[PDB]
Enzyme design. Structure first.
Site, short mmCIF file in Angstrom:
data_model
loop_
_atom_site.label_atom_id
_atom_site.label_comp_id
_atom_site.label_asym_id
_atom_site.label_seq_id
_atom_site.Cartn_x
_atom_site.Cartn_y
_atom_site.Cartn_z
N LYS A 68 40.10 39.99 43.98
CA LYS A 68 40.36 39.68 42.77
C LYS A 68 41.80 38.69 42.87
O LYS A 68 43.09 39.60 43.21
CB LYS A 68 40.48 40.98 41.98
CG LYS A 68 41.31 40.72 40.59
CD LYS A 68 41.28 42.17 39.91
CE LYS A 68 41.95 42.15 38.59
NZ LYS A 68 41.99 43.49 37.99
N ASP A 118 48.20 40.07 34.43
CA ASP A 118 47.34 40.79 33.74
C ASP A 118 47.68 41.23 32.04
O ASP A 118 48.24 42.41 32.31
CB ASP A 118 46.48 41.58 34.20
CG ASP A 118 45.15 42.21 33.36
OD1 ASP A 118 44.86 41.75 32.54
OD2 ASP A 118 44.63 43.38 33.93
N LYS A 177 47.68 44.81 26.71
CA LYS A 177 48.45 45.96 26.99
C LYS A 177 49.52 46.30 26.56
O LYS A 177 50.27 45.68 25.64
CB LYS A 177 48.75 45.87 28.57
CG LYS A 177 47.54 45.84 29.43
CD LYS A 177 47.98 45.34 31.12
CE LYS A 177 46.84 45.03 32.01
NZ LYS A 177 46.12 46.18 32.11
N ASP A 180 48.47 42.09 40.30
CA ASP A 180 47.01 42.06 40.16
C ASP A 180 46.27 41.01 40.92
O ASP A 180 44.88 41.00 40.66
CB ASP A 180 46.66 41.90 38.50
CG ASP A 180 45.57 42.71 38.19
OD1 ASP A 180 45.28 43.73 38.74
OD2 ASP A 180 44.83 42.27 36.99
N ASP A 183 40.54 43.46 28.98
CA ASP A 183 41.38 43.93 29.92
C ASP A 183 40.41 44.35 30.70
O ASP A 183 41.27 44.79 32.01
CB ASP A 183 42.29 45.03 29.31
CG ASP A 183 43.54 45.30 29.99
OD1 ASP A 183 43.67 44.44 31.17
OD2 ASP A 183 44.09 46.25 29.89
N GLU A 232 38.85 42.64 33.03
CA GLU A 232 38.49 41.09 33.45
C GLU A 232 38.54 40.77 34.73
O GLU A 232 37.83 39.82 35.01
CB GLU A 232 39.75 40.27 32.94
CG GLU A 232 41.01 40.19 33.91
CD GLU A 232 41.83 41.54 34.25
OE1 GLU A 232 41.71 42.31 33.22
OE2 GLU A 232 42.37 41.55 35.33
N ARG A 269 36.52 42.68 36.93
CA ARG A 269 35.09 42.42 37.10
C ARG A 269 34.36 41.29 36.56
O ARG A 269 33.39 40.79 37.50
CB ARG A 269 34.34 43.53 36.62
CG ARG A 269 34.40 43.81 35.11
CD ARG A 269 34.02 45.07 34.71
NE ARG A 269 35.22 45.85 34.69
CZ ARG A 269 35.30 47.40 34.53
NH1 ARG A 269 33.92 47.75 34.24
NH2 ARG A 269 36.25 47.97 34.69
MN LIG Z 1 42.97 44.31 33.02
MN LIG Z 2 43.37 43.22 36.29
NA NA Z 3 44.60 46.01 36.41
#
Ligand SMILES: [Mn+2]
Ligand SMILES: [Mn+2]
Ligand code: NA
Ligand SMILES: [Mn+2]
Ligand SMILES: [Mn+2]
Ligand SMILES: [Mn+2]
Ligand SMILES: [Mn+2]
Ligand SMILES: [Mn+2]
Ligand SMILES: [Mn+2]
Ligand SMILES: [N+]
Ligand SMILES: [N+]
Ligand SMILES: [N+]
Ligand SMILES: [N+]
Ligand SMILES: [N+]
Ligand SMILES: [N+]
Ligand SMILES: [N+]
Ligand SMILES: [N+]
Ligand SMILES: [N+]
Ligand SMILES: [N+]
Ligand SMILES: [N+]
Lengths: 499, 499, 499, 499
Positions: free
Chosen positions: A270, A275, A282, A293, A352, A354, A356
């Site tokens: 990832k 993020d 957030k 992230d 959020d 995201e 996946r």
């Molecule tokens: Mn996220």
């Molecule tokens: Mn993330």
């Molecule tokens: Na995260």
């Protein structure tokens, strides 16, 4: 970062070795093992005379530093406490190593010699101890200061010698060589994680991969841009990326160290370089930590770096799904429905969740390699921190033999993971009235339902999923920053698969 | 806003002065003062006869309006209570004056004469009482109705005469002239702050400065764009502005009323046209008041307007750092590291601490003028409202003499500030593991930590910082809007420096 | 969706009608009704004998399904409980109808015949009952599955026969014909509401209107884009739209089914295709449901669709004000002041009160049609859900007769509304110190003050306002999705106005 | 705790002094000071030979520990870095002293001698350096472990010798004696603050006061229970206490060290032994830190303990207003109105503003002593932490001379305070429609309006108010616990008043 530390294994007598600092272990309250006893004898009892004065209780990690002692070729002798137990556990061993390194860093000695072969560590022979000791020492030397105007004074310490008996020296040597390659990998991972997000964007990561190919002729790199991703049909990958000015990248790493007929292992990382949550924004508090992230993708970099140095006889593929998650007038909205590259439709209830959505398209892409295993690594869910905390990574998968191999590698590395179940009963939390899958399952079992989501793209191969949201970085204090986990676990897994 | 109300000082007898309304003070439970006694006698006791019916208790600001009285040339007599005290405090004097203007505004009289020279105000002589009275009356006539389809009916009142003894006339006249210039500057500041953020953006403020230069030939103006800010290396400033479609602007005002040998005084203002918080987005409740986030820059416009009218013998420089803080796909992210003009690296942990990021680059630019004083004014911290409220401004600085000069000016102007300490022990709160300075220091001592941040860019000159977050505007009610503070304190400071 | 269900009214004997399933009502503890008795006798008491075994208590909606019975031409007989009261309320009638439909859906029969003429419904004659029964059955067949990879099995059920006495069949068939047109309009409304917001943007709605004109040659459509809106002076409509990459549209629908000399009715629909809140951003939880923030405009689509099918002799105008509300670097800011079409200025204190900002410019546009009524429909305030819940729409207006007509239509359609007062005392909650109107009035009486805001643009005609924030969609569970309300109320209003 | 470390001042030569550890300062890149050079000479250059190897850079607080050196009577020599400055600031001096103590604590030496007379501390002569040095060392020995089952190993270190020139020795002696009395008082303060609230309730504090009177015959103690408080009419004090099962106490301490004709100084201490907030209940997170809400009263204990040790010639009164703030079925409700001892009615809008309600009745009680100064100390407002942080106490008062005496005392003690203004404009935030005073003034200027409330009970004498909400304890980390501030400030104030 730079590295440089030379690690040598020698089988010579401690009491006549020329060194700036000789390091000896002392039990609670003296006890003196074989090496320390021989050095004491050579001084005519000066060391036991000092210890008798009582300044060093001998608890794990306590220290007492002596200058020139009679008849020694060591300019200094550093005594470190080893506790009262006959064997140390892994945590005490690391603590002892770190206390030694911390003292040596402050000294002006150009080298040090470790006469620590008398220590026993539970369940660990000569090779397994060297792996833990050298990894701790080498990773402990890491420094990230490239945006500091006042840089740290360079260390005088440039060489560390491990004293071992001749019968163990080969095992210690091999453990040291593997540990150094792992630490070098973690240093790359930590640098990529620690970089600010205005520098370390997906395009930057693409160029870093090309640079790694310059260093290592064995590595082949390809970098796909948004046009290619749209050609491939990665609708959910593109949905995550579309709100940002920064274009996405899919980075493909390939290393062929085994026969052409050996199925590859695939690592999927990832790489969300920052993020914000997107439209599902957030809160502000602590959101600077979302530069970590992409630590999943960073750990794929780090693992490749370690394997390329070791030249392991395996075939290895890395897929780094890189994007930036930003709010904007063209960002993905909660309730959007997109078509993944697999053809499954996904209702994006929460922008959020995201990670996946870039991983699922990479997992579909991985099918083309006909892999014998596929592991994705991702700072995926805050729920994993609630479940397992900051010192154990979450582990799920669709093949129990592969899950077992990863747990075992994590226990050997002292980079531990823990399995969570993907019971079929959890899957219905992802049901959507409007699409094939919802991208979130609600407030119960958040780490598991994220793994259930990914599992729906991994059916054609043996697959596991490491959720490193808790283990990939330290949040605050002097030591805030990326950790380099799970490079030690991943590299140890590949080391075993290469035998 | 035009204003245009005429203030005159005269030494003639009140009881033969021709006027639409003659205003007299009436104490609570004590004898008519000298002037009111003379008017009363002139009427044959008609005023004392009315006061004996007991309608006017004489409390501060109470009023009684009489029509035509025997033997007077005033069409009306306004009696206003002055309390029972021998001397009034500043707040009481202002309250008395506002009570008088309220009554006069509702009348069809084209003029009014104030015979209040017998009122005593604590620690205030003739010049000081005139400064306070004329400033209260002139600023109380402020009107903002630009976007109102139904504009207010024009006032019949166009002239106010201050009656004074011939011995105090010159001092009362000097106070009126200075007070009128301060109120004219406050009206410009209040207009700029009350303007909607879709109209008052950085480019608009640069065109307003060019207009001030067309009106005052002693004023020179230079407006710099983003390209020039980039040539200068102002990364903190450009980082705050990158998220908005509205271009940033640095406005430079220069006025040379003294000799070329006199080092200039520099005023630096925060011109954030609108503050959404950025990616670190603020809540929606009350966010409309973030249009007042450019009131520091507006205060520099207002002080320049007052000094250009009074033609003070001083060299003045104005630096207005103007930008709009907006969320976007190219906006600055929490965790971004930027290089300031000074070369100091800054980690932006919170995009809602952007005022210090535009001011730090402006303070570095100010060094070229070799200033004898540098004062920054900014709506910086809500922690200042928790610490000092909405009536007292926060003051910090690296020079005790400048801080004391600004505190004394605030006391004279009745626009008071209060010093908060910049002890070195607070500086560690801005420590970053990744850069030279973090842009935030945590939930403790927010106003002081913001000043500690700016102090790291002001070490080459005498510097002070005014936090006007609580004093620059009224949040709600019928008087919601910009105050014009701290133009009164800043103009008084410059007046003392011009002597 | 495509619909296709045939509804027929027949006056034949139930016991000799060939059908896949014959549906009979059974009372709780009262004798079989007239139709059920005749069928039971035709069987020789087979049905009486089964019911005597007691499996069917006869509570509303309970069912008992029989296969072949002696002497019948129905392959199956379905018994449905009708309760113990002599008359049913609307809710129980719907419950009964839905239970019948749910059983039929699961059967392989190609048709069914309903011998339910015996049921009595409080205050409903044959036409009123048929309107309710057929609308519940037809709308109960709605399916939305266009993003499901695994589509639902097509139903075998293709034909439903309503058995009615010859004396009633004319009224039953008229109710049935009207109910079908309403259901078809609801299906269009539900589709448009259920579409994801990345597909159903304002441009998409414009094309959908053009498509409706290809289907119904009586319909004229015009679609205005951003350039035309700016020509018209629609400043507050444009302010809502400006944050998004998606351009806005004003869609004008015109249907002239009456003489040219007769004034039109105008329907004004809120078409916010997604509502993030803008800079005043919403929380993430449940924000996917903001795809339903265009259900106001969708209901205008659906009402036109039903009116076009019925070819009512009325003149009808539809105005759909469509925009997408997103945060961006060019989005509207809290505190912006804009000029509406009408010339009134509006202070946008909260960018999430955006629906009234597109509606008010549409209300001004509507003046040109010299209408005899204007109804706006909008998912406008969460406060309406607090006031009236999810089953009754809020209704406000400036004409008591029009308000009464809409309430009466709602009662007849069983799609009820409820009036809230627009007392002039509420209007002062919209006072702004800076503009003619603020766009929000604070936390008290939120539905009413939104209505007061709109009323300021509707003074030139008879106007009402339906707040459908609670009735336009179902939030969670299996039945999450658009409802199609208030198409049944609106169409019944037009049906009455057409007589 | 027990304390009892012996501090001696001697004027002998460091190089012939018999000691377990001799402590010398080493500058960063400047020559050894006089003392250190004398010792190096006596060893024949051994210390300078080691330093040439480079292990000790000489930064403030770095250490290098040597064993027996030739020709010394010191068993060990500890070198501690003193930085590169010619003078140290208070903070560096404390850091240096703390680093020395930390090393000595870990050694088995029974004593140590400190040859640090060459150190210059900015603005501090011999007496002022000794005050700071000995207070840091003595307070650094503090240990609180009474609820730990594993107690700390007793220290071997039992004696510390300060080496001073004979010309300075009397002043160093006097500073050391004062410092140890202050440290002994801080140890009592810290113990009382650290005790858990189920042990340390008001009754317990009363018995602690009686124990103090057993130990010091000069001290007289009186303890009033709830019956006596009600007879005195302290309705506001009683309102705070009534919700709790623990009865309240007013503790009166009296010490008469001067002629009976000297008016006393009065210290008033907030002793809320636990603050739940009451019906205005606090959130759960961090509520355990409300056991420190009696630290105001504890500091009065500690200041008396130091004054009684020193036998200062002053008359001193202590008033500790002790209660526990709990929710229950009989607790004070928001909106209650109570009559204070002074007769002023107070409307209790928030039961978590309870400190000022016990203090105000104590301030009225204090009038009977006809004091020449009254100082209250209270962990009063979290707003003080926002304004001044955790390192500076807030200070407010009705007498500018008293306020200046306390600021000066805090600067000398290095236990600093900072004045905040009690301008009359702030008083109206306490206006209540229902009572003479409201007990809270809203979210602005919370520390100031709290001081304003108290000032209304203190008009009959010179009074000052110390808000130690941020300075009285440390929140987390290894060193969580009470600090004992402001005992150093208060004791220094009393020392100066006693001359
Ligand atoms: Mn996220
Ligand atoms: Mn993330
Ligand atoms: Na995260
Ligand atoms: Mn901000
Ligand atoms: Mn701001
Ligand atoms: Mn909205
Ligand atoms: Mn909306
Ligand atoms: Mn409290
Ligand atoms: Mn308290
Ligand atoms: N030594
Ligand atoms: N361990
Ligand atoms: N498997
Ligand atoms: N392993
Ligand atoms: N990491
Ligand atoms: N500002
Ligand atoms: N019903
Ligand atoms: N049209
Ligand atoms: N109707
Ligand atoms: N309402
Ligand atoms: N009252």
């Amino acid at each position: 970062f730079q590295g440089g530390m030379e690690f040598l294994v020698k089988s010579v007598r401690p009491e006549t070795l020329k060194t700036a600092t000789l390091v000896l272990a002392v039990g609670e309250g003296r006890k003196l093992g074989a090496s320390a006893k021989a050095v004491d004898d050579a001084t005519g009892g000066a060391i036991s005379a000092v210890l008798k004065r009582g300044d060093l209780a001998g608890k794990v990690g306590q220290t007492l530093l002596l200058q020139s002692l009679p008849n020694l070729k060591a300019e200094r002798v550093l005594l470190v406490g080893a506790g009262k137990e006959r064997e140390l556990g892994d945590r005490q061993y690391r603590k002892l190593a770190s206390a030694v390194l911390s003292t040596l860093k402050g000294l002006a000695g150009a080298d040090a010699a470790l006469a620590l072969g008398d220590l026993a560590v539970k369940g660990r022979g000569a090779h397994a101890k060297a792996r833990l000791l050298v990894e701790t020492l080498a990773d402990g030397l890491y420094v990230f200061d490239r945006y500091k105007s006042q840089k740290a004074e360079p260390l005088k310490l440039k060489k560390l010698t491990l004293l071992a008996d001749k019968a163990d020296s080969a095992a210690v040597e091999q453990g040291s060589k593997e540990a150094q390659a792992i630490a070098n990998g973690m240093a790359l991972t930590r640098d990529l994680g620690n970089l600010p997000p205005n520098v370390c964007h997906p395009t930057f990561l693409g160029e870093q991969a090309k640079g790694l190919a310059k260093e290592f002729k064995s590595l082949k790199v390809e970098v796909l841009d948004e046009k290619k991703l749209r050609e491939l049909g990665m609708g959910s990958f593109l949905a995550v990326a579309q709100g940002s000015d920064q274009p996405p990248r899919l980075i493909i790493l390939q290393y062929n160290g085994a026969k052409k007929d050996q199925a590859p292992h695939v690592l999927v990382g990832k790489g969300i370089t920052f993020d914000t949550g997107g439209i599902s924004l957030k809160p502000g508090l602590g959101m600077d930590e979302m530069k970590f992230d992409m630590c999943g993708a960073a750990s794929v970099f780090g693992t490749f770096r370690a394997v390329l140095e070791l030249q392991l006889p395996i075939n290895l593929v890395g897929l780094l799904a890189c994007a930036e998650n930003m709010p904007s007038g063209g960002a993905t909205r909660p309730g959007d429905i997109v078509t993944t590259m697999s053809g499954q439709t996904v209702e994006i209830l929460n922008t959020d969740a995201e990670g996946r959505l870039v991983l699922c398209d990479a997992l579909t892409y991985a099918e083309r390699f006909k892999p014998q295993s596929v592991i994705d690594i991702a700072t995926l869910t805050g729920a994993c921190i609630v479940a397992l905390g900051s010192n154990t990574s979450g582990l799920m998968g669709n093949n129990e033999a592969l899950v077992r191999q990863l747990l075992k590698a994590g226990e050997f590395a002292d980079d531990r993971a823990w399995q969570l179940p993907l019971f079929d009963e959890y899957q219905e939390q992802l049901d959507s009235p409007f699409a094939d899958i919802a991208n979130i399952g609600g407030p119960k079992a958040g780490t598991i339902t994220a793994g259930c989501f990914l599992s729906r793209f991994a059916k054609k191969y043996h697959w596991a999923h490491l959720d490193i949201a808790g283990t990939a970085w330290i949040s605050g204090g002097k030591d805030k920053g990326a950790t380099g986990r799970p490079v030690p676990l991943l590299t140890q897994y590949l080391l075993e698969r290469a035998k």
